[PDB]
Amino acid sequence: EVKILVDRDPIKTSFEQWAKPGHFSRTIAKGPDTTTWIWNLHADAHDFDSHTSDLEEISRKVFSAHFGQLSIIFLWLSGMYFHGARFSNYEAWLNDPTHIKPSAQVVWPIVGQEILNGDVGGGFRGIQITSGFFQIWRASGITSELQLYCTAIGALVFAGLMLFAGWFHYHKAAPKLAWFQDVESMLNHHLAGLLGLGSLSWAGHQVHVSLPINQFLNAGVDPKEIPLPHEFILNRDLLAQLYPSFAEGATPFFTLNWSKYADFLTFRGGLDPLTGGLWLTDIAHHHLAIAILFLIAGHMYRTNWGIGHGIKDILEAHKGPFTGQGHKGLYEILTTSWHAQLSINLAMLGSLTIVVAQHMYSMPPYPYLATDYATQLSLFTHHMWIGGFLIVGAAAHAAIFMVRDYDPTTRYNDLLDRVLRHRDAIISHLNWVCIFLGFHSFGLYIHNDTMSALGRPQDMFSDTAIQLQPVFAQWIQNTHALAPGTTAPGATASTSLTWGGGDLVAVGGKVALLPIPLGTADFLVHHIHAFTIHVTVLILLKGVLFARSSRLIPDKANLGFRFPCDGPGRGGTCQVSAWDHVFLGLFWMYNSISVVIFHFSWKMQSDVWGTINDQGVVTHITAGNFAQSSITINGWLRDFLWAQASQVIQSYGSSLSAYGLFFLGAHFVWAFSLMFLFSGRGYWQELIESIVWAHNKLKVAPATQPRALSIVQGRAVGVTHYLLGGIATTWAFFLARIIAVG
Amino acid sequence: GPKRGAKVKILRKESYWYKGTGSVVAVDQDPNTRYPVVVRFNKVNYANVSTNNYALDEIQEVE
Amino acid sequence: MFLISWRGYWQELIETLAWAHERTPLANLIRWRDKPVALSIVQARLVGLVHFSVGYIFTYAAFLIASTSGKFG
Amino acid sequence: SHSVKIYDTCIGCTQCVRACPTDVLEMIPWGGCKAKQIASAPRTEDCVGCKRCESACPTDFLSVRVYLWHETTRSMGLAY
Amino acid sequence: YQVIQPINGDPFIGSLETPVTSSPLIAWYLSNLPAYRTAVSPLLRGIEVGLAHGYLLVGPFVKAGPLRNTEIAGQAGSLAAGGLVVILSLCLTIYGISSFNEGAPSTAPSLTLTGRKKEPDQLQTADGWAKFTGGFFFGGISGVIWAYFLLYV
Amino acid sequence: AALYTHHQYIAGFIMTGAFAHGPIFFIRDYNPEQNADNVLARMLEHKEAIISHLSWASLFLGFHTLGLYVHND
Amino acid sequence: TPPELDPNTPSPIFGGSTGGLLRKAQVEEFYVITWDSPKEQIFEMPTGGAAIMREGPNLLKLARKEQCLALGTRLRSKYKIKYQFYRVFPNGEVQYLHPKDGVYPEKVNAGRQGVGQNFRSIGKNVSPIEVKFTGKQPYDL
Amino acid sequence: DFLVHHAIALGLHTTTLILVKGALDARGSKLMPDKKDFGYSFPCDGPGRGGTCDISAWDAFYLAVFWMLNTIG
Ligand code: CLA
Ligand code: CLA
Ligand code: CLA
Ligand code: CLA
Numbered sequence A: 001e002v003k004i005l006v007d008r009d010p011i012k013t014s015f016e017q018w019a020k021p022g023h024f025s026r027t028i029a030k031g032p033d034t035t036t037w038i039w040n041l042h043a044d045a046h047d048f049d050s051h052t053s054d055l056e057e058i059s060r061k062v063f064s065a066h067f068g069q070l071s072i073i074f075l076w077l078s079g080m081y082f083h084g085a086r087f088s089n090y091e092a093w094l095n096d097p098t099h100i101k102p103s104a105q106v107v108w109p110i111v112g113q114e115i116l117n118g119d120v121g122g123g124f125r126g127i128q129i130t131s132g133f134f135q136i137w138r139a140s141g142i143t144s145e146l147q148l149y150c151t152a153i154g155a156l157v158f159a160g161l162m163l164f165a166g167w168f169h170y171h172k173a174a175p176k177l178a179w180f181q182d183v184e185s186m187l188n189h190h191l192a193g194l195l196g197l198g199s200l201s202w203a204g205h206q207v208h209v210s211l212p213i214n215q216f217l218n219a220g221v222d223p224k225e226i227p228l229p230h231e232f233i234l235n236r237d238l239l240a241q242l243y244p245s246f247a248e249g250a251t252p253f254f255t256l257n258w259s260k261y262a263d264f265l266t267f268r269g270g271l272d273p274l275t276g277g278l279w280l281t282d283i284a285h286h287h288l289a290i291a292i293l294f295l296i297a298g299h300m301y302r303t304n305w306g307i308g309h310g311i312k313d314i315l316e317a318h319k320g321p322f323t324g325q326g327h328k329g330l331y332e333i334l335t336t337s338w339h340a341q342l343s344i345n346l347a348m349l350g351s352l353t354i355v356v357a358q359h360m361y362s363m364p365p366y367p368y369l370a371t372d373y374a375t376q377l378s379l380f381t382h383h384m385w386i387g388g389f390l391i392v393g394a395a396a397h398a399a400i401f402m403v404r405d406y407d408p409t410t411r412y413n414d415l416l417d418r419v420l421r422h423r424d425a426i427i428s429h430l431n432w433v434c435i436f437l438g439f440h441s442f443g444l445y446i447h448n449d450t451m452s453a454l455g456r457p458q459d460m461f462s463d464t465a466i467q468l469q470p471v472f473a474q475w476i477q478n479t480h481a482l483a484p485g486t487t488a489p490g491a492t493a494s495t496s497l498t499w500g501g502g503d504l505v506a507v508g509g510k511v512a513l514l515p516i517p518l519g520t521a522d523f524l525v526h527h528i529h530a531f532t533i534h535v536t537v538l539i540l541l542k543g544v545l546f547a548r549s550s551r552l553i554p555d556k557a558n559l560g561f562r563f564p565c566d567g568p569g570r571g572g573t574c575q576v577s578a579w580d581h582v583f584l585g586l587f588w589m590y591n592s593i594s595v596v597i598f599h600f601s602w603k604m605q606s607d608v609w610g611t612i613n614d615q616g617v618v619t620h621i622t623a624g625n626f627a628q629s630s631i632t633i634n635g636w637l638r639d640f641l642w643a644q645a646s647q648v649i650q651s652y653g654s655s656l657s658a659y660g661l662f663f664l665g666a667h668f669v670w671a672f673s674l675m676f677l678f679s680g681r682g683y684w685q686e687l688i689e690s691i692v693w694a695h696n697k698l699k700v701a702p703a704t705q706p707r708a709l710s711i712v713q714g715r716a717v718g719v720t721h722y723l724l725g726g727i728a729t730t731w732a733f734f735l736a737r738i739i740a741v742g
Numbered sequence B: 001g002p003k004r005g006a007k008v009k010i011l012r013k014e015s016y017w018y019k020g021t022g023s024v025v026a027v028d029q030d031p032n033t034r035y036p037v038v039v040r041f042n043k044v045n046y047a048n049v050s051t052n053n054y055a056l057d058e059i060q061e062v063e
Numbered sequence C: 001m002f003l004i005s006w007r008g009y010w011q012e013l014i015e016t017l018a019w020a021h022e023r024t025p026l027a028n029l030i031r032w033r034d035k036p037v038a039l040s041i042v043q044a045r046l047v048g049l050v051h052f053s054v055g056y057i058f059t060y061a062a063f064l065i066a067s068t069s070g071k072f073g
Numbered sequence D: 001s002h003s004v005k006i007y008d009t010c011i012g013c014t015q016c017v018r019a020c021p022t023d024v025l026e027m028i029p030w031g032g033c034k035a036k037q038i039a040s041a042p043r044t045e046d047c048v049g050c051k052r053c054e055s056a057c058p059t060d061f062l063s064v065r066v067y068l069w070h071e072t073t074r075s076m077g078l079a080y
Numbered sequence E: 001y002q003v004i005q006p007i008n009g010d011p012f013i014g015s016l017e018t019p020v021t022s023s024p025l026i027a028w029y030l031s032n033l034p035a036y037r038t039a040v041s042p043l044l045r046g047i048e049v050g051l052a053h054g055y056l057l058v059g060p061f062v063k064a065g066p067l068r069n070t071e072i073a074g075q076a077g078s079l080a081a082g083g084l085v086v087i088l089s090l091c092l093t094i095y096g097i098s099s100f101n102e103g104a105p106s107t108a109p110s111l112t113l114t115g116r117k118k119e120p121d122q123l124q125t126a127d128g129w130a131k132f133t134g135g136f137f138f139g140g141i142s143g144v145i146w147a148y149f150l151l152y153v
Numbered sequence F: 001a002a003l004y005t006h007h008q009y010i011a012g013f014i015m016t017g018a019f020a021h022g023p024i025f026f027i028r029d030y031n032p033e034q035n036a037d038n039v040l041a042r043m044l045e046h047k048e049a050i051i052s053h054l055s056w057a058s059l060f061l062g063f064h065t066l067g068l069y070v071h072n073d
Numbered sequence G: 001t002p003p004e005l006d007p008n009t010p011s012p013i014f015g016g017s018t019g020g021l022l023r024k025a026q027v028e029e030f031y032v033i034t035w036d037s038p039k040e041q042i043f044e045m046p047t048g049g050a051a052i053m054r055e056g057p058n059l060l061k062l063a064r065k066e067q068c069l070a071l072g073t074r075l076r077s078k079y080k081i082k083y084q085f086y087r088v089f090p091n092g093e094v095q096y097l098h099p100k101d102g103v104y105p106e107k108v109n110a111g112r113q114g115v116g117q118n119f120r121s122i123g124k125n126v127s128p129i130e131v132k133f134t135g136k137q138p139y140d141l
Numbered sequence H: 001d002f003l004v005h006h007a008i009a010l011g012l013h014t015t016t017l018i019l020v021k022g023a024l025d026a027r028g029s030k031l032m033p034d035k036k037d038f039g040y041s042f043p044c045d046g047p048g049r050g051g052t053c054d055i056s057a058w059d060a061f062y063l064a065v066f067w068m069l070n071t072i073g
C-alpha cells in the first residue's frame, strides 16, 4: 500500500552542533590531539554509513543533501542568467552571431588585470565564454536582457525553495524508510512525471515560443522588432502566418489528422543550412514523441492498484542453466543499499554524459553552435571528463557496497556469488586482453615511429603503405548515409552530416559540418581507446571483485574499504584496498580521456573545421595532416602538441594571457603532485620532528601536534593535484588554441 | 622512588617523550615488576598513547 | 609507473595470472621453476628511479645535442 | 623466515597475539609485569611480516619487534 | 539441470568444469593432440608439433617481412622462420636442461580423471624432453622447407 | 655543451652517493662510545638544529624565488 | 595432552570456485580445518564465494594457514564455534597446528616455554658495529 | 642570472636537506628509535604508528635523487 510516510520533527534545529566540530562521529567529536583530526573531519563528513547504522536516518540525510545540491545548482544557473543579462554582449551577439564572440564575464580594473577584458565585439570588452549559453538562449527565443533577469530571479527563488525543502524534509517532516523504498512508485513518477511531463511541457515552450521567434530571427528581423513570446499565444494569427496548421487549432490533434501538423512537426534530419543547427521543428517533434514514450513508460510498475509489474517478479523470473537462481535477491539488495544504487547510477549517468558529448558534436542542437568551435571543443571535453569521473565513482561505490553492505547470509544473490567464484578467470582474461590490445595498438605507433626514423615509410601502418582500414565503421557510415532513401523513408536527410555520404553545411563562411573520413589513423586511435578503457576497467573491476578477499589477504574485508595496506609482509602489500584501485583507476581514466579529447581536437581541426571559400573550396585549420601525422608519436609531439601550444605560449600581453598563466600554474600543480605520489610519510614525519624541535626552542610549538599526512591522504592529495594539474593544462591549451585560431 | 604526581624527566632514549617531562601516577611495590614507575604525559605519541611504564633509572625528579 | 603504483595490486594480479597459467591446457605442460611474484617495495623504488633517471638523461641529451648541432650556434 | 622478538617492557595485554593472522605469537607465564604474562614467538616459520602485532602494541617503545629476514614461500604469503 | 560443476566433483580444487573446459568435442580434440599422447614416444610428438609450427611460421614472415615486396620474399621469410625454429629449439633445450635432472623421474600426473593409476608422461623427463626438442627441430625445419616448397616451387 | 652537462650530472650523482655512504657509515660502522663527545657525536647531538635550519633556508629560497618568478610572469 | 585426531569428515556445501587449491597443495603443502556446527548455515569462503556448513563435523582443505586462521576466526567470532587446523604434506603426513596446546594463545597457559624473548628493553640493543663480521644480529643477543 | 642562481641555491640547499636529514636520522628518530637495527635499506616499518613509508636512509637517498636531477636540470 504505497503512501506518504513521514516522521514529525526528528531533529531539533540548533546551532549547538555548529559549535561542535565532528559532532557526527564519536571519535572526532572529542577534539584534536594531533592535526590528523582536522583532515578526518572533512574526510568522513559525508560518509553517513560511518555515522549511523540506521538506514532511515542515512536516507533522510541523503535526501536533504540532494536538496542542498539542487539549491546550489539553481543558484549557479541564477548566476549564469544574471551575468548574461548584466555583464554581457548578448543582444549585440543576437544582431550578429557569426562575427561576435560570446562574452558574459568582465573584470575590475586593478593590478593590470583589465587587459583580460578583450575585444569580443558588440562594442563590449570582456572574457569570451565557451559554455554555450548564448546559443541556448537564442534557441529558447530569448531576445532581451530583461527576460534573462527574470529567469535569474526565478532561479534564485528556486534556490530558496530547494534549500527550504532540505531543511523541511530533514528537520520538520522527514520521510520514513518505507517511503524511500517505494521503488515502483519512484520509477513511475520519475519516468512519467519528471522526464515525460518535462519534455512535454518543454515541447510546449518550443512549439509556442521557440519556433516562431526563431523563425523571425532567421528571417532577419531585428530582435527588438520581433513580437514578444506571449503575443504568439494571445494572437494565434501570428503562428498561423508562420505555421498555417494553427488555423485549425487543436482539432486535427483530436481527430487524428496529425498530417496537418507537418508544418511545425517535421522529420527532415540533418542541419538547417542558415544556422548550422538541427531543425527546431525536428526538435519539437522529438520532444513530443519522447514525452509520449516516457509517459506510457511511467505506467509500468504496480502501485496502489492491481495493474502493473512487480520488480521482484521480473527479477525472479530471469534465471538460466548457466546462472542457476539468476536475478533473485537483487531487489532486496537494491532496496537496502545506497552504495549499489550509487554505483549503477554513476556508471549509467557517466556513460550518458559521454554519449551526450558525441551526439552534441555530431548533431549540433543549438543555432550557431557548430561554427562556434571554442564552444564545441569545450563542451565535448567537459562532458567527457565529467563522464569519466562519474564512471570511476561507480567503481568506488560498487566496491564500497562490496565491503560494507554485502552479506550472503541474509541478502544472497546467485549472480554475484557466481561472479565471485570465477573472479580469477575474469581478471586474468581482462589482463591478457589488455596486454594484447596495448601491443596491437601502441606497438603499431612505435613500429611507425621506428620505420619513419629508419627512412622506411613504405613499411609503416598508414593509408599510403600497409593499410588498416576501418571497414566496419565505413560500412556503418555508408548505411546511415543511404538510410533516408531505404530504411527510413520519412526522413529527408541523414541524422548527421558526419556520415560517409552527403553535402556540406557551412554558416557565415565557416564549416559547420561535413562527412568525416575514416582511415588507418582512426583505426589506430580507436584501438588506443579500446585499450585504455579496457585497462581502466581492469583496475577498477579487479578492485571491486577482490575487495573482500584474495589469496594474499584472505580477510581483506575486515580491513575496510579505505586503508593503506596490510604491511610490508607477504613481500609487500601496498595498495591492496579497493580505494587504492579507485586511486590508480583515476590516473588511467585521466589517460584515456586525455587521448580521447586530443583525438577529438586534432580530428576536428584537421578534417572538419576551417573556412570555406566561394565555389566550395574548404581550407581546414590544420589542412588534413591528421591522416599522415597522427600515425606516429612524434607526429602528436610535433604537429599537435608543439604546433598548437603556440597560441597558449604567446598569449601574454593579450586577453588570453590568463590561459598562459593557467598553463604554467597547471604544469606546476601537476609536478607538485609528484612529491606526494613518489614519497612516503615517514620522511615527512621525521622532518616534522626536527621542525617541531625548532618551534619548541622558541616556545611556539602548537598543542595540536603537527603530523605528516596519512598514507591514504598522501595518495589522495597526489592524485587530486595530478588530475587538477593535467586537466587544467589541457584546458588552457585547448581554450587558447581554439579561441585564437577559431 | 618518586612520589605520586611528581614531575619527572624521561631518560629512556627510545621514548616518544625522551628528555621531556611527565607526571607519576603510581609506583608498583612488587620488586619483580621491571618497570614500576607509571607515567602519564601531556601529549600523545605516534600510537595515540598518553601513558607508559618506566624503571627507577629511567626517571629524574625535577622542578 | 613504478613510482606511483605500489606492490599489493601487482601481487594479486600476478596471483590471478598464476591461476590462469595452471588452468590453461597445452600451456599447462610448461611450468616455472621460480614462483612469479611482484617486485619488492624497495626494488620498486629503485627500478622506478632508474627509469626516471635514464629517461631524464637521455631526453635532455637528445635535446641538447640536436638543438645545438642542428645549427651549431 | 622473518624474526620476531619480545622485550621485557611487555605488559602482557595480549593484543599482539590476537592480532596475528597466522598464529605466530602466544602468551606465557611471567613475573615481570602485573598481568603475570609475556608474549612469545614460537612459530615464526608461519610469520608473514605484516606487522599487525606491532601496530597493536601499546608500549613505548615497542615490546614486540619484527625484523623481516630470509624470504620463504610461507612468508611471501603465496598460495601457489 | 546445471551447466557448471566443480572440477572432477571436487569443489575445493581451484578450478571449474565448463563446456569450454570439459565437453566431449574439446576433450576428444585435446586428447588427440601430440602434446597429450601420454603413452607414445615424445620424439614423434615433437615431429608433429614442430612440423605444424614451422609450417604456420612460414606464413607471416613471408608476407609481413621487410622483403615482402621483392622477388626474394619466399627465401627471406622461410629463412627467418627457420631461424625462429632454431631459436625456439634453443629455448626448448635450455628449458629441458634447467627443468629436468637426468636422474629425476617424471613430474607428469600419474592419475586419470576417474582416479586410476597410469604411466606418467615421459614428456616430463630429461631424455623425453630432449627427444621432444629434437623432434621440434627436425620437424620444424622440415615444415618450413615443405611450406616453402608448396608456396614457391 | 655535452661536456658541461656530462660532468655536472656526473658530479650530481657522485654527490648524492657521497651523502649515501655517509649514513651507511652511521649505521654499519659508527661506534658511539669510541666517538664520545667528539665533533661527530656532537654533530648527532644537535641534528634537529642542522635539519631545521636547512629546512628554513630551502623554504625561504623557494618561497621567494618562485614568488619573484611568478610575479614577473 | 594429546592433539586432536584427523578423520575423513564430510566437506561443506559449495559449487566450487577458482580460489581453491593449486599445484602447491600437490608438491609442497596444503592445510585442513575442522569444526563442529550446531546446524546447516551459510558462511563466506576465505577464497571467495558463499558456502554452506553442514551440521556436525566439517572438514575443509585450504591452501594457506592464514586462510585457515581467518575462517576459524570468523567461525569463533560470528558463529560461536570451536575450530582446529592442521598442515598436510604430499607424502601423507599430517601436522597438528592450531590451537597448539588446546588453549588459545590469547590467554595464558602453563607449559609454554619462551621463544625469542630478550630480557632487556629494546633501546639497549648493541650497535651493528658490535656484531660486524659475526653471524649475529643486535636482536639475537 | 640572479634569479636562476637563486634557483640553484634552492636546489643545493634542498638536496642537502634530504641527504643530511637522511644521514643524521639513519640510526633512529622518535618515529623509529631503533632504525639502525634494520640497516641502510628496508621497505618500511609498517602502517602502525601513523604509517612509516620511505623512512629508511636509503629512501632518503632515493628521494634526494629527484632533487639532484631537478637542480642539475
Ligand atoms: C556560482 C555563481 C556565481 C559566480 C561564480 C559569480 C562570480 C562573480 N560575480 Mg556574480 N552573481 C551571482 C552568481 C555568481 N557570481 C548571482 C546569483 C547574482 C544575483 C544576486 C550575482 C550578482 C552579481 C553582481 C551585481 C556582480 C557580480 C560580480 C561577480 C564577479 C565578482 C565577484 C565579487 O568580487 O564579489 C564581491 C566580493 C565579495 C562580496 C567578497 C565577500 C566574501 C565574504 C567576506 C565571505 C564570508 C563568508 C560567509 C560564510 C559568506 C556569506 C554567507 C551569507 C549567508 C551571510 C565574479 C565573476 C560582479 C561583477 O561581475 O562585476 C563586473 C558584480 O558587480 N555578481
Ligand atoms: C538554517 C538553519 C539550520 C540550522 C541551525 C541547522 C542545524 C543542524 N543541522 Mg540542518 N539543515 C538545514 C538548516 C539548518 N540546520 C538546511 C537548509 C538543510 C538542507 C541542506 C539541512 C539539512 C541537514 C542534514 C542532512 C543534516 C543536518 C544536520 C544539522 C545538525 C548538525 C549540522 C551541523 O552542525 O553542521 C553545520 C554545517 C555547516 C556549517 C556547513 C554547511 C555546508 C553547506 C550547506 C554546503 C554547501 C557549501 C558549498 C559547497 C560552498 C563551498 C565553496 C567553496 C569553498 C568550495 C544541526 C542541528 C545534521 C544532523 O542533524 O546530524 C545528526 C545532518 O545530517 N541538516
Ligand atoms: C554521485 C555523486 C557522489 C556522491 C554523493 C558520493 C559520495 C561519497 N563518496 Mg564518492 N565518488 C564519486 C561520486 C560520489 N560520491 C566520484 C565521481 C568519484 C571518482 C573521483 C568517487 C570516488 C570516491 C572515493 C575514492 C571515496 C568516495 C567516498 C564517498 C563517501 C564520502 C565522501 C566524503 O565525505 O568526502 C568529503 C568531500 C570532500 C573531501 C571533497 C574534496 C574533494 C576534492 C579535494 C575536491 C577537488 C577539487 C576541486 C575539483 C577543485 C578545487 C578548486 C580549489 C578549491 C583549489 C560519500 C558516500 C569515500 C568513502 O569512504 O565512501 C564510503 C571515499 O573514500 N568516493
Ligand atoms: C605490437 C604491434 C606490432 C605488429 C602487429 C608489428 C608487425 C610487424 N612488424 Mg613491427 N615493431 C613493433 C610492433 C609491431 N610490429 C615495435 C613496437 C617495434 C620497435 C621495436 C617494431 C620494429 C620492427 C622492425 C625493425 C620491423 C618490424 C616488421 C614488422 C612486420 C613483420 C614482423 C614479423 O616478421 O614477425 C613475424 C610474425 C609472427 C611471428 C606472427 C605471430 C603472431 C600470430 C598471428 C599469432 C597467432 C595466434 C592465434 C591467432 C591464436 C589462436 C591459435 C589457434 C587458431 C590455433 C609486421 C607487419 C618488419 C617490417 O619490415 O615490416 C614491414 C621489420 O623489419 N617491426
Ligand code: CLA
Pocket: A668, A671, A672, A673, A674, A675, A676, A678, A679, A683, A687, F055, F058, F059, F060, F061, F062, F063, F066, H010, H014, H017, H018, H063, H064, H066, H067
Ligand atoms: C614542482 C613540484 C614540486 C614543488 C613545488 C616542490 C616543493 C617543495 N619540496 Mg619537493 N619534491 C618533488 C616536487 C616538488 N617539490 C618531487 C617530484 C619529489 C620526489 C618525491 C620531491 C621530494 C621532496 C623531499 C624529500 C623534500 C621536498 C621538499 C620541498 C619543499 C622545499 C622548500 C621550499 O622550496 O619551500 C618553498 C615552498 C614551495 C616551493 C611550495 C609552494 C607554496 C606556495 C607557493 C604558497 C601558497 C600559494 C597559494 C597561497 C596557495 C593557494 C592554494 C589554495 C587551494 C588554498 C618545497 C615545498 C623538502 C621540504 O619539505 O623542506 C622543508 C624536502 O625535504 N620535496
Ligand SMILES: CC1=C(/C=C/C(C)=C/C=C/C(C)=C/C=C/C=C(C)/C=C/C=C(C)/C=C/C2=C(C)CCCC2(C)C)C(C)(C)CCC1
Pocket: A077, A078, A151, A152, A153, A154, A155, A158, A197, A200, A201
Ligand atoms: C528555464 C529556467 C527556469 C524556468 C522554468 C520554467 C518557466 C518552466 C515552465 C514550466 C511550465 C509552464 C510547465 C507546464 C506544464 C504543463 C503541463 C505539463 C500540462 C499538461 C497537460 C496535460 C498533460 C493535459 C492532459 C489532458 C489532455 C491532453 C486532454 C484530456 C484532459 C487532460 C487535461 C488530462 C527556472 C526559473 C526554473 C530556473 C532557471 C531555468
Ligand SMILES: CC1=C(/C=C/C(C)=C/C=C/C(C)=C/C=C/C=C(C)/C=C/C=C(C)/C=C/C2=C(C)CCCC2(C)C)C(C)(C)CCC1
Pocket: F018, F019, F021, F022, F023, F025, F026, H023
Ligand atoms: C672563494 C675563494 C677561495 C676560497 C675557497 C674555499 C676555502 C672554498 C671552500 C670550499 C669548501 C669548504 C667546500 C666544502 C664542501 C663540502 C662538502 C661538499 C661536504 C659534503 C659532506 C659529506 C658528503 C658528508 C659525508 C659524511 C656523512 C654524511 C656522514 C659522516 C661522515 C661523512 C663525512 C662521510 C680562494 C681564496 C681559495 C680563492 C679565491 C676565491
Ligand SMILES: CC1=C(C/C=C(\C)CCC[C@H](C)CCC[C@H](C)CCCC(C)C)C(=O)c2ccccc2C1=O
Pocket: A675, A676, A677, A679, A680, A681, A684, A707, A708, A709, A710, A711, A713, A714, A715
Ligand atoms: C609534502 C608531503 C607531506 C607534507 C605536507 C603536509 C604536512 C600538508 C600540510 C601543509 C599545510 C600548509 C599545513 C596546514 C596549515 C594550517 C591550516 C595553518 C594555516 C596557516 C594560515 C597562514 C593559512 C606529507 O605529509 C606526506 C605524507 C604522505 C606522503 C607524501 C607526503 C608529502 O609529499
Ligand code: SF4
Pocket: A564, A565, A566, A567, A568, A572, A573, A574, A575, A680, A711, C006, C041, H043, H044, H045, H046, H047, H051, H052, H053, H054
Ligand atoms: S604502504 Fe607504506 S607502510 Fe604500508 S606497506 Fe607499502 S610501504 Fe610499508
Ligand code: SF4
Pocket: A569, D002, D004, D019, D020, D021, D022, D023, D024, D025, D046, D047, D048, D049, D050, D051, D052, D053, D054, D066
Ligand atoms: S608480523 Fe604479522 S604475522 Fe608475523 S607475527 Fe607480527 S603479526 Fe603475526
